[PDB]
Amino acid sequence: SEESQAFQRQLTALIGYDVTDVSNVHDDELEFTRRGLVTPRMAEVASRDPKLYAMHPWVTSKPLPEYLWKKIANNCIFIVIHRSTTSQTIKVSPDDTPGAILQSFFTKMDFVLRVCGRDEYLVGETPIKNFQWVRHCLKNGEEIHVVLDTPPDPALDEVRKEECDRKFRVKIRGIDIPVLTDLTVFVEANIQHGQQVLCQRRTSPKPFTEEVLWNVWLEFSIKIKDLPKGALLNLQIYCVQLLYYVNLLLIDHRFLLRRGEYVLHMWQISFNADKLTSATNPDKENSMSISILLDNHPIAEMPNQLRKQLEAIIATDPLNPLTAEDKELLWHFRYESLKHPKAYPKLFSSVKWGQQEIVAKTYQLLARREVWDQSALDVGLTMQLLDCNFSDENVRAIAVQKLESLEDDDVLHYLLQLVQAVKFEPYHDSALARFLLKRGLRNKRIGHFLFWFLRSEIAQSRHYQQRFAVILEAYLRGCGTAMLHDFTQQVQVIEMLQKVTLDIKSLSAEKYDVSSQVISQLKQKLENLQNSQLPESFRVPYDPGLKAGALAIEKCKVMASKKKPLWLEFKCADPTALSNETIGIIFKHGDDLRQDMLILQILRIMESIWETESLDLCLLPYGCISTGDKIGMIEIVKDATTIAKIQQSTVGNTGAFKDEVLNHWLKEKSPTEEKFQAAVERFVYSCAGYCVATFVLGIGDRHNDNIMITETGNLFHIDFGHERVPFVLTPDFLFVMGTSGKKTSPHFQKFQDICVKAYLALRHHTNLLIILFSMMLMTGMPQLTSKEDIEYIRDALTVGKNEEDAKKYFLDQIEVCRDKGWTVQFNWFLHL
Ligand SMILES: C[C@@H](NC(=O)c1c(N)nn2cccnc12)c1cc2cccc(C#Cc3cnn(C)c3)c2c(=O)n1-c1ccccc1
């Protein structure tokens, strides 16, 4: 049908890539995946409740933390209901449900309760203590305001109708680069499984000309019958240095042995998740290529010391290497290992995947999954089984099975790095992709962030754009017409605003200070865009509950920075919004904001870890979406400046520094002395939290220009673009603490206490943090050495040490900060 053709046009515009484009492929795996994803999409579409789906209540099953219980000593909670511009307060027990509040509301004086100024609803049979909006109002000491609205028409989510024993041999023909010190170049063929090179052959070294020819059969030691599914033929081009790489799945999505002629366009090197992609470089014009031929196809006692050695192995951290003896022990006593869910990553990383019968034994082992299936959900282990070291279908399938039991709250907590983990899938259609599709189609918020996460990569990396676009298209074909409309207008808005950001950046030279003519130009462009081209309103991508409307063109500016970010402020389209404050958005080009996304998501995961132990470090992981190559959006935190400007105002701008300035700023920006006390408390907590987080992630040695503070004392690092010091604990922070280099005021003692507590809390989830850090590096960083870079978070988390030594370690970090002072801060200016 032609309507379906226009609809595919629409989907392509939304995705930023055409999934029907068969130009850059050597098989039909992407199409097979588009076709296979139809079943789960339609299943979840038929299974989801229209009412709850449309109202998407953001709830949780976690208990209410201790610090938020300290805010409801009355066992009562006030809710301010607005029938129609007439507000009345109702007392509610934390256990009262939305329906209960209705049956009592009409007994104090069908419908639905919505959050004022937001597309959020308090619906469904959940104790209203478990509504995220209520927990937020409690955390920030705010009243819970609600509009009595009608249930959003469930019909608005309408969904359109869907419509043998032979050694493996590979002939290397040659390499061709259309245009390119010749030196020497050779080709290396690696049969790999999960980054584990099962075998390896090479060619002879030849001078590198724009065309090099071998026509040589490379025979590998592996028999064809031994090739495991998901095995990659990894072709690399060296010259000591690795110049090019590319990959081909030896077994396809049909269990068929790959066979025939292949001319693969390769990726150039500027370890790394990009080195695993099966996609070929779509730039057939400039990129190197290689020609290959495949002609080969149907798919009871245990001593004490040994059990102790085995448990020692099992107990070590995820980054602890496994000796050959360790692997042989794990494998010989594999049925004992199966009783310990934590031994699973190490047990399966001890499988000889290059042997067919060993893999069959491993599968028979996976059949004994009683202990694994009846074990509590350990996210660290699931992540470990989903990373780069596991290419087997069933191994990863068990991790996805464990993920299945997660609630939408935790799925949002881990969605970014699950999407990223999709990069470790050998095949486009995988249990992980299907699970992300399911959980996005089941919940509108998860689907919103899934759209934006998939699109951040689709429009930025050719390595995985095709796969992510297949998945995003599968999702869009089931999210519903309302969400398609929202996504369309969101994309249009962000594209206009990125146009403006780049066009303004062009108008300025290296000299930072922007001209007056450029202020005129920005005002002109914004007013021109506001009249007609800019839609009436749009959902804030990083906060899907907010609808932004008209531009406050008088408040829009551009920073006098090397990069020219745009500071835009919108009005809230929701007339029932309880305030008049503007929605702040920073549109920035020049930084890779995928790294910012990842660091922020790890920060949120750490906050949840701390909540599990009744701690609240008041971190502020502002919204942040990467929309394209070194371009994205950032949430504008209200009433926040930078420590740098707080120094510049009073101490001058010649690298000078004074210590009392922070406290004077907090007291002059504090209306009441009591609110200043509250601001100092918030400062201590947030500073401890950010010190701990920034040391754990190895990003603590920042410049005070990249550290901000709110007028209400809340501190927070920003711009994670990319003599040292473990973290930023400068003397101006200490003078707010109440210490003069040597003293130890009650607030500094509280700060040290909170630091040690949070640090040990993180050490409790050591494994999960290690795996998340490893995945973040592998999927979001430029280039990382597996040995050096990753193994920072082991020492940072002081692996293997008892809690006493870890406390002493973090306290000595604090003492290093105390000892150095402004050394690094001043050195930043010095090295101009
Ligand atoms: C500090 C910096 N970023 C934030 O403030 C911020 C926030 N509010 N949330 N958030 C969340 C994550 C990361 N960053 C943030 C910031 C960005 C910026 C982005 C675009 C345009 C402009 C501007 C301007 C301007 C024009 N004429 N004149 C006099 C000033 C700016 C700007 O001025 N500053 C800034 C610098 C020092 C002191 C105070 C403000």
**282 in Cβ contact with 23 (< 8 Å):** yes
Q: Is the CB of 640 under 6 A from ligand 1?
A: yes
For residue 214, give the DSSP letter. Answer: E
* CA-wise closest residue to 409 among 449, 365, 366: 449
Grouping H, G, I as helix, E, B as strand and the rest as coil, residue 558 is strand
CA distance readout (Å), 139 to 113, 479, 672, 832? 21, 32, 20, 43
- Could you tell me the distance, in angstroms and rounded to a whole number, from the CA of residue 711 to the centre of ligand 1? 14
H helices of 716-802, in order, are 731-737, 746-764, 766-780, 792-796
Let me know if residue 742 belongs to a domain: yes
Q: Is the CB of 636 under 6 A from ligand 1?
A: yes
β-pairing, 260-265 vs 557-558, is unpaired
3-state SS, 436-461, equals HHHHHHHCHHHHHHHHHHHHHHHCCC
The H or E element containing residue 369 is none
- Beta bridge mates, 115: 146
Grouping H, G, I as helix, E, B as strand and the rest as coil, residue 29 is helix
| CA dist., res. 431 & res. 449, Å (int) | 19
Which residue shows structure tokens 């090397």?
562
| CA dist., res. 444 & res. 422, Å (int) | 21
* CA-wise closest residue to 195 among 234, 243, 224, 229: 234
Let me know if residue 583 belongs to a domain: yes
3-state SS, 463-523, equals CCHHHHHHHHHHHHHHHCHHHHHHHHHHHHHHHHHHHHHHHHHHCCCCCCCCCHHHHHHHH
Does 673 share its domain with 821? yes
> What single string gives the DSSP state of each residue in 592-657?
-HHHHHHHHHHHHHHHHHHHTTT---------EEEEETTEEEEE--TTEEEHHHHHHHHH-SSS--
Grouping H, G, I as helix, E, B as strand and the rest as coil, residue 582 is coil
Grouping H, G, I as helix, E, B as strand and the rest as coil, residue 58 is coil
- Could you tell me the distance, in angstroms and rounded to a whole number, from the CA of residue 8 to the centre of ligand 1? 40
| CA dist., res. 39 & res. 481, Å (int) | 19
Q: Phi and psi at residue 733, in whole multiples of 5°?
A: -70, -40
Does 93 share its domain with 195? no
- Other Cβ atoms closer than 10 A to 636: 16
Let me know if residue 832 belongs to a domain: no
Q: Dihedral angle at the C-alpha atoms of 769, 772, 773, 777, nearest 10 degrees? A: 180
Region class of 155: left (phi > 0), else alpha (psi between -120 and 50), else beta: alpha
* CA-wise closest residue to 185 among 254, 268, 242: 242
- Could you tell me the distance, in angstroms and rounded to a whole number, from the CA of residue 641 to the centre of ligand 1? 8
- Could you tell me the distance, in angstroms and rounded to a whole number, from the CA of residue 569 to the centre of ligand 1? 12
Token pair for 725: 């010091």
| CA dist., res. 191 & res. 169, Å (int) | 11
Does 216 share its domain with 277? yes
Which of 516, 557, 600, 711 to probe ligand 1 with, by most ligand atoms within 8 A of CB?
557
| CA dist., res. 466 & res. 191, Å (int) | 24
**484 in Cβ contact with 15 (< 8 Å):** no
Q: What is the resolution of this structure in A?
A: 2.7
> What single string gives the DSSP state of each residue in 289-321?
EEEEEE---------HHHHHHHHHHHHS-TTSP
Grouping H, G, I as helix, E, B as strand and the rest as coil, residue 362 is helix
* CA-wise closest residue to 462 among 292, 246, 176: 246
Q: Is the CB of 519 under 6 A from ligand 1?
A: no
Q: Is the CB of 637 under 6 A from ligand 1?
A: yes
| CA dist., res. 362 & res. 359, Å (int) | 5
- Beta bridge mates, 170: 218
| CA dist., res. 641 & res. 715, Å (int) | 10
456 exposure class (CB count in 10 Å sphere: 0-12, 13-18, 19+): buried
Does 679 share its domain with 814? yes
**355 in Cβ contact with 328 (< 8 Å):** no
**666 in Cβ contact with 598 (< 8 Å):** no
- Could you tell me the distance, in angstroms and rounded to a whole number, from the CA of residue 591 to the centre of ligand 1? 15
| CA dist., res. 717 & res. 233, Å (int) | 43
651 contacts: CB under 8 Å, gap ≥ 6: 657, 658, 661
Residues in the chain: 832
3-state SS, 691-733, equals HHHHHHCCCCCCCHHHEEEECCCCEEECCCCCCCCCCCCCHHH
Token pair for 679: 């601001």
Does 290 share its domain with 225? yes
**Domain-terminating residue out of 464, 480, 496:** 480
| CA dist., res. 170 & res. 290, Å (int) | 12
Q: Which residue, by CA, sits nearest to atom 22 of ligand 1? A: 559
Residue 638 Cα: closest atom of ligand 1: 8
Q: Is the CB of 13 under 6 A from ligand 1?
A: no
Greatest Cα pair distance, the chain, in angstroms, is 89
H helices of 321-407, in order, are 324-332, 334-337, 344-348, 356-366, 370-373, 379-386, 393-404
| Host domain of residue 608 | 481-638
How many CA atoms, within 13 angstroms, populate the side-chain half-sphere of residue 171?
12
Crossing angle of the two packed helices 593-611 and 766-780, in degrees rounded to 10: 170
Residue 557 Cα: closest atom of ligand 1: 26
554 contacts: CB under 8 Å, gap ≥ 6: none
| CA dist., res. 282 & res. 26, Å (int) | 11
Does 525 share its domain with 589? yes
Q: Which residue, by CA, sits nearest to atom 32 of ligand 1? A: 559
Q: Is the CB of 565 under 6 A from ligand 1?
A: yes
Token pair for 485: 């409309």
Q: Which amino acid is at 745?
A: S
* CA-wise closest residue to 431 among 465, 392, 476: 392
3-state SS, 226-289, equals HCCCCCEEEEEEECCCEEEEEEEECECCCCCECCEEEEEECEECCCCHHHHCCCCCCCCCCCCE
| CA dist., res. 794 & res. 481, Å (int) | 47
| Residue-wise burial string across 279-289, b where 16 or more C-beta atoms lie within 10 A, e elsewhere | bbbeeeeebbb
**639 in Cβ contact with 710 (< 8 Å):** yes
Cα 491 from chain centroid?
Answer: 20
Does 490 share its domain with 571? yes
| CA dist., res. 104 & res. 85, Å (int) | 20
| CA dist., res. 378 & res. 383, Å (int) | 9
Let me know if residue 831 belongs to a domain: no
For residue 124, give the DSSP letter. Answer: S
How many structural domains does the chain have?
5
Does 146 share its domain with 205? no
| CA dist., res. 483 & res. 54, Å (int) | 10
Q: Is the CB of 711 under 6 A from ligand 1?
A: no
Grouping H, G, I as helix, E, B as strand and the rest as coil, residue 587 is strand
**Domain-terminating residue out of 458, 480, 502:** 480
Let me know if residue 146 belongs to a domain: yes
Does 302 share its domain with 446? yes
Straight-line distance from the first to the last Cα atom of the chain, in angstroms, rounded to the nearest whole number: 63
Does 673 share its domain with 768? yes
Q: Which residue, by CA, sits nearest to atom 20 of ligand 1? A: 567
> What single string gives the DSSP state of each residue in 386-416?
HSTT---HHHHHHHHHHHHT--HHHHHHHHH
β-pairing, 707-710 vs 289-294, is unpaired
Residue 622 Cα: closest atom of ligand 1: 11
Which of 500, 514, 520, 567 to probe ligand 1 with, by most ligand atoms within 8 A of CB?
567
β-pairing, 260-265 vs 232-238, is unpaired
* CA-wise closest residue to 634 among 716, 695, 696: 716
- Could you tell me the distance, in angstroms and rounded to a whole number, from the CA of residue 683 to the centre of ligand 1? 20
Q: In what order do the strands lie in the sheet with 707-710?
A: 640-642, 707-710, 715-717
Q: Is the CB of 523 under 6 A from ligand 1?
A: no
**186 in Cβ contact with 204 (< 8 Å):** yes
* CA-wise closest residue to 17 among 567, 469, 498: 469
Crossing angle of the two packed helices 324-332 and 304-315, in degrees rounded to 10: 110
419 exposure class (CB count in 10 Å sphere: 0-12, 13-18, 19+): buried
* CA-wise closest residue to 729 among 640, 826, 628, 819: 819
Residue 566 Cα: closest atom of ligand 1: 20
Q: Which residue, by CA, sits nearest to atom 39 of ligand 1? A: 641
Q: Phi and psi at residue 535, in whole multiples of 5°?
A: -60, 165
Our CA angle for 422, 425, 427, nearest 5°, is 120
Rg (CA), the chain: 29
Does 391 share its domain with 474? yes
Residue 642 Cα: closest atom of ligand 1: 38
CA distance readout (Å), 259 to 22, 190, 293, 294? 20, 17, 7, 5
- Beta bridge mates, 634: 586, 624
Grouping H, G, I as helix, E, B as strand and the rest as coil, residue 586 is strand
Binding-site residues, in ranges, read 584-593, 619-627, 716-722
Our CA angle for 771, 774, 778, nearest 5°, is 135
What contacts 24+ positions apart, CB below 8 Å, involve 320-323? 322/346, 322/349, 322/350
**Domain-terminating residue out of 147, 162, 177:** 162
For residue 85, give the DSSP letter. Answer: S
Q: Is the CB of 586 under 6 A from ligand 1?
A: yes
| CA dist., res. 270 & res. 555, Å (int) | 41
**463 in Cβ contact with 267 (< 8 Å):** yes
Does 271 share its domain with 131? no
Which residue shows structure tokens 């030196």?
183
Q: Is the CB of 648 under 6 A from ligand 1?
A: no
701 exposure class (CB count in 10 Å sphere: 0-12, 13-18, 19+): middle
**174 in Cβ contact with 372 (< 8 Å):** no
Q: Is the CB of 557 under 6 A from ligand 1?
A: yes
- Could you tell me the distance, in angstroms and rounded to a whole number, from the CA of residue 567 to the centre of ligand 1? 7
- Other Cβ atoms closer than 10 A to 231: 25
Which experimental technique did the depositors report for determining this structure? X-ray
| CA dist., res. 115 & res. 123, Å (int) | 11
Binding-site residues for ATP, in ranges, read 584-593, 619-627, 716-722
Grouping H, G, I as helix, E, B as strand and the rest as coil, residue 126 is coil
Q: Phi and psi at residue 434, in whole multiples of 5°?
A: -65, -35
Which of 708, 709, 710, 719 to probe ligand 1 with, by most ligand atoms within 8 A of CB?
708
For residue 185, give the DSSP letter. Answer: B
